[PDB]
Amino acid sequence: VNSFSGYLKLTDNVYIKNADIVEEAKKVKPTVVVNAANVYLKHGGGVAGALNKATNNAMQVESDDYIATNGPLKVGGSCVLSGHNLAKHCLHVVGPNVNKGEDIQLLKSAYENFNQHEVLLAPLLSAGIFGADPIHSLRVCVDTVRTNVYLAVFDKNLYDKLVSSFL
Numbered sequence: 001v002n003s004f005s006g007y008l009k010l011t012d013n014v015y016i017k018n019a020d021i022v023e024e025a026k027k028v029k030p031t032v033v034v035n036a037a038n039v040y041l042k043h044g045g046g047v048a049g050a051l052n053k054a055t056n057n058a059m060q061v062e063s064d065d066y067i068a069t070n071g072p073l074k075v076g077g078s079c080v081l082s083g084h085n086l087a088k089h090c091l092h093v094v095g096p097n098v099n100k101g102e103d104i105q106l107l108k109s110a111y112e113n114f115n116q117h118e119v120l121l122a123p124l125l126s127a128g129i130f131g132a133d134p135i136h137s138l139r140v141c142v143d144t145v146r147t148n149v150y151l152a153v154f155d156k157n158l159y160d161k162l163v164s165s166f167l
């Protein structure tokens with residue numbers, strides 16, 4: 001039993017809801033919140049911009065030190081950093097950005113990072129400003145992630161579309 005509330009059960013381990021991931025994280029304080037990161041951990045917009053704003057820019061400060069030490073992530077890769085006031089940990093995961101021309105096949109590799117964590121609050125990877133079809137992202141999520149994933153979808157119209165088309 002965990003503290004997530006109001007989710008629709010899509011599969012054995014995947015749950016989906018219309019929610020602002022920032023507000024969901026602040027309320028649930030999950031062990032792991034997933035950020036829709038880029039390879040530079042520059043949290044300017046989209047989900048990353050919103051998560052970073054909620055930490056009063058502390059996520060960005062921590063991230064800049066991480067990059068200065070380690071260099072950029074790989075597309076499809078991840079790193080674990082602090083969750084600040086939102087979660088115990090933040091798993092920064094880089095899905096391919098379609099508005100950059102990156103290979104959508106890397107979306108499966110990106111979701112594989114979720115399997116290192118028993119329970120996660122997460123957005124759909126590569127959705128939104130990353131340019132991929134959120135329906136496809138959901139399919140890859142369900143077919144790749146084996147741990148318990150709670151997907152927060154900000155847009156109510158998109159949430160409704162995501163449920164009604166799910167196979």
Ligand SMILES: Cc1c(Cl)cc(S(=O)(=O)NNC(=O)c2ccccc2O)cc1Cl
Pocket residue numbers: 036045046047048123124125126127128129130134152153154155158
């Ligand atoms: C960067 C990013 C990611 Cl990676 C994931 C999500 S989401 O999982 O909340 N889905 N939402 C959408 O695709 C969307 C599309 C068109 C208009 C509004 C939308 O909200 C949002 C964002 Cl901005």
